[PDB]
Design a binder for this molecule. Sequence first.
Ligand SMILES: OC[C@H]1O[C@H](O)[C@H](O)[C@@H](O)[C@@H]1O
Ligand SMILES: OC[C@H]1O[C@H](O)[C@H](O)[C@@H](O)[C@@H]1O
Ligand SMILES: OC[C@H]1O[C@H](O)[C@H](O)[C@@H](O)[C@@H]1O
Lengths: 437, 439, 437
Amino acid sequence: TESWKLLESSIIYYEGNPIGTVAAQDPELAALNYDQCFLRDFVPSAFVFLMDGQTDIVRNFLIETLTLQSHEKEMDCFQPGAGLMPASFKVESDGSKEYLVADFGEKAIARVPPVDSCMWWILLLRAYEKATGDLTLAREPKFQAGIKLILDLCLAHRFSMYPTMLVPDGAFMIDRRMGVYEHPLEIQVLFYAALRAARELLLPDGDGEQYLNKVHGRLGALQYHIRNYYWVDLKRLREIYRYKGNANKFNIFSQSIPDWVIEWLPEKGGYLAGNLGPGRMDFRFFALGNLMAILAGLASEEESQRIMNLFAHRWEDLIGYMPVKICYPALQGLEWQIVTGCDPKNIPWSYHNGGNWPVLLWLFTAAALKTGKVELAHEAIAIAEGRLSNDKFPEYYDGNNGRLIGKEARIYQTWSIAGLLVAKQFLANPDHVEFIS
Amino acid sequence: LRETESWKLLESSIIYYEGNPIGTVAAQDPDQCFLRDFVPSAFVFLMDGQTDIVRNFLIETLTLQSHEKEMDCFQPGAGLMPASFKVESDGSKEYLVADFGEKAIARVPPVDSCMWWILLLRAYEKATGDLTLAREPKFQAGIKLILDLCLAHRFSMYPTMLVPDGAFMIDRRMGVYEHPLEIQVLFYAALRAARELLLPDGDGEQYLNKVHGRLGALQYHIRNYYWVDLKRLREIYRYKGNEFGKEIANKFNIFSQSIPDWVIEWLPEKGGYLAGNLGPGRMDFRFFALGNLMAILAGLASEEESQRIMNLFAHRWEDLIGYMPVKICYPALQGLEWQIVTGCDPKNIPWSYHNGGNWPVLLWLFTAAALKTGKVELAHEAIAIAEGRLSNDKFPEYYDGNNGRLIGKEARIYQTWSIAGLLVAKQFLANPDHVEFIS
Amino acid sequence: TESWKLLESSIIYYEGNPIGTVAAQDPELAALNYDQCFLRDFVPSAFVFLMDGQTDIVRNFLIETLTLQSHEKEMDCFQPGAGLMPASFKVESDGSKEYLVADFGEKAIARVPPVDSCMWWILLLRAYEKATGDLTLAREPKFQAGIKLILDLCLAHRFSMYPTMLVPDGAFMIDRRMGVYEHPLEIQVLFYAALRAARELLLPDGDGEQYLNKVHGRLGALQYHIRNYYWVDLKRLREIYRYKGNANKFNIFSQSIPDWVIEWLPEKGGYLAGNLGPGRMDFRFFALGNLMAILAGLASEEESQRIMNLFAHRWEDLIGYMPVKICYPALQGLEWQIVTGCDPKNIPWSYHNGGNWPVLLWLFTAAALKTGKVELAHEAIAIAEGRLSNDKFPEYYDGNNGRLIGKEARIYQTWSIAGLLVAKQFLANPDHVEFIS
Ligand SMILES: OC[C@H]1O[C@H](O)[C@H](O)[C@@H](O)[C@@H]1O
Ligand SMILES: OC[C@H]1O[C@H](O)[C@H](O)[C@@H](O)[C@@H]1O
Ligand SMILES: OC[C@H]1O[C@H](O)[C@H](O)[C@@H](O)[C@@H]1O
């Protein structure tokens, strides 16, 4: 079919071998960095290849990125943690020899750190092991060392009383300044998910035993903290609205609860908030964080049900014309200005700021399946299928309900293409959902 | 239909000049004849068969054109028609006095008045069968003088007609300057009429050549650049800014971030409309009813395009028709935009008058367009709504509010074209062949 | 000196001959259309060459543009008036042959019409005749025909009761949407100035006699209308503020007089307003319109004095760090949005919207000289000289007082360079001011 053929065209070969897929195949626009392979972008590609049985590419991807981990990465005589995985890479030729060049954030726009990338790497490594049955790769000293360098960076002692992870703005899939600084849901959910993965991956050698305990320790803390403090429902909103200023551990002034939240939430709906920090709660709903919370089992069974109840009751908002809304609602007017620095790629209901992202369909489908809401997966896929092909698989969609093709969206965006495929594969064989859960 | 209340108010409205009927007053609110206002009145009379008044009207208004008018030490184009005229008595004789814009509030020029004159002449012709009138040397000269002004050479590459703000039914500053839809549509319609009405005799062939050239360029321009639907909207939203060259998509440099949020949500999948205005760096996305409805009747819109406009009305019935047909334009300018665009004009406050008001007269255009596209149920529902209020409300000039719940703030009562509007619409409904006069 | 050498480098040769100067010599930025010769840009260049005695270039410029007038210009099967001069032109090669390509507005951004260009052409033709003493050029049938085609376009009967000229937005030096639609001062002043020029240029043959009368007729009307209706001073503001709604011929609601105007105007200051139309008066101050009104003698003697009194009392606003402010004040916030269509090149105090333009120094100097305010010319030139060279002659400056180098300004902008030169030439020999007056 059309989609498989596009996916194969996106494949990047290195020394005769396939090692990844390009971000997009848009002929008209500037190559920019979309000719590169992004670690976060490759995940849904990997899943298609894993399910198809052609696993070489995923193995090689993991081997090459592990080697990139060891590359030299710096800006102005300062090195980040050694475990840092890159945002993306591409294949360059100096005459006859081929070599890999990575962007670890020293080339990236706004110099954002690709914090979710080392998380996805660990998750994908686990996904690869479960899908193939190849235990050989994770056992090697190289990979054990690489997992450990990541954990060193994650579990490093920081100035905080909480087990969450502190990041600058634009740390995850949202790579632009969007007020997702401090402790955004996505990073915490993926952090948790990566810690869970690390348990089966870490060999319990003398050194490893030290790591597994730290992992198990943080997993517990992290789950308590996210479920008790990030969780939002009407019951919880009533509690927060009545809190005293200066029980409230984060000093939330109830006048700082938005109007829209109260009217938006159905009685049986709920979700994990976007962010938590001193004097601050981000009541914006972030899709990927919430769906992965379901998949990774971070959310409880009821909480998972309440999230899908929320998608059901607020379908136009969160799915509309193109699944899935990245976050809701959009920053608008002056708020857009202060929070994003007048970032013109993120105008209201566009891109990170309220846009609709096809790739997220694969997470929505998995999470719908895990919670038994099959009808919702059918409808979301039906919606996506009706437009994507005709629209040439746009990177994103814009507007309250995703009616517009994204303002600066690239066409033939690989994870949009891969997102649809993976969602159809899950629908055909729901047991494959185990790989991401 | 002559026994009915409306007809009686219409007969009362008639102005007489030396024992001859020449027009109708704007209102009988407890005055003078506006050229644009007379059109619906004329339509009722012609269908009923009283044509002497329409004929006399065209004669008298043609004579006024030749009158010498000036502002200060400068005189404007010879072919300019007046906004209105009235009968002032010497005491010993009756004579006609005209307002060509030199007496008008805001000193605006009535461009549409000339348009409507030509259209009414054709309307006269096609209803009576009388060809003699338009063929008279006087009328040929009159038509030509109007064409001289419309076909005035331009500095720009736009085949549209350049005008100042408030140059049509909206006679007050409303941000309708430059290239407003209504004017372009009536311009097109006036050119069409000029194809039949003009004689190739003498200088006639030279005029027909300029007319035919413009009709094509103008039709192409409006359909390709003013037309708005989701498909087209998606293209514009993805335009890159600051494109320079002969072959480029964004010829008018529209910045997508400037496109309002309401438009995206307002359009139905199967609906569409022609934009309010188009100029350098600007697109007015406001829906304008008279321009859009005339674009259907004059055949300026294609068949599909005409269907897609009526789909919009149906899908957005409360916004466009609501309590009183028909919303003059949507949406209202509000807050700081109303200030900047209208100059804090207290008569055009949000959802009032020109700025989002509902105007009875527009019902006849809506009915005509409904019939022509075969959506009769819409004309019927529209007439039903209007019929239920007007008589009781004493036929107000317009209505105010998002949906026209309020009677117009400064609306005149017993407004003639409000009355005529309803009569015309009913006459079209009874005999849909009468729609051929404006098409 | 540095400036002469830069000016010569800008010179454009055609078939071995110099025919004009490029807009800018900025190496780093995209060539765009700044590699072209703009008719409005060439004027201050021409003046330098006229004063230097090397006049060939100006003669050839006029001959070539006259030929361009006769070129085919259209968009979508519609032709503008035959007299339309182009915005700009450049030299192209098809192998060995060289040919001229013009932009008449069918290539221009936003499709703006270069209405001021045919005006400057006539003015420059007159300037050339007076400076050189060459009466040969304007007498030729070609040039008489060309002047006449322009007049046909200008004096064409339009739907208006006034003698002013109706234009779309972006018709003059301000080539972007800036609320200068309808009847902007600049067009009216230049129109007047061009009509005055046409009197000495038009041969009084049988055909010409018909033209001269129309010219003389319009000159009178136009001057009355501009002086009586556009003129602004406190006396006039008091009159307008007390006007009744619905004496007031343009229906100006006194609540639509801005606050800033009243406080801004000194007792002995005055100016010609930016625009006049139905229900509308643009109280913004536009520099070029006002200065040319002085030069062309459109303004009276006292009115000219009151304009310079205004520059003197409001020097920081209108001159500040870089002469001269193009218009004051800037459109801001929401007003910028509605009026300019969120045009990012025209953000507040930037470019057309409140920017400071070096080129305008040559008009300021001429107008200061004509009115006897020599000290003001010295100071304005002193100010300009201190920055321009070091800044590499930026196209424009930004900010309330022109502290910033213009946001997207090109460097080595020819009319910035030429502007300074012409202003120094005028200061050295004030009798040369006659050429533009
Ligand atoms: O498609 C590759 C990249 O595109 C954009 O930069 C997205 O914001 C980022 O999340 C993605 O990884
Ligand atoms: O009824 C006479 C006039 O009334 C109002 O002024 C309307 O704005 C105008 O369109 C109409 O022609
Ligand atoms: O410098 C050439 C051109 O540059 C910019 O486009 C200016 O707005 C314009 O006035 C000038 O003619």
